[PDB]
Curated annotation (Swiss-Prot):
The chain holds residues 62 to 86 of 87 of the full protein. It comes from Heloderma suspectum (Gila monster). GO terms for cellular component: extracellular region. The keyword Metal-binding does not apply. This is Exendin-4. It is found in: Secreted. The lineage of its organism: Eukaryota, Metazoa, Chordata, Craniata, Vertebrata.
Length: 25
């Protein structure tokens, strides 16, 4: 993947949008 990601993953790597944190994308 060439981004969306990079910001992303981090997001789900954390715990997903279940985090206080919404989509990269």
């Amino acid at each position: 993947e060439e981004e969306a990601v990079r910001l992303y993953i981090q997001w789900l790597k954390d715990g997903g949008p279940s985090s206080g944190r919404p989509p990269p994308s």
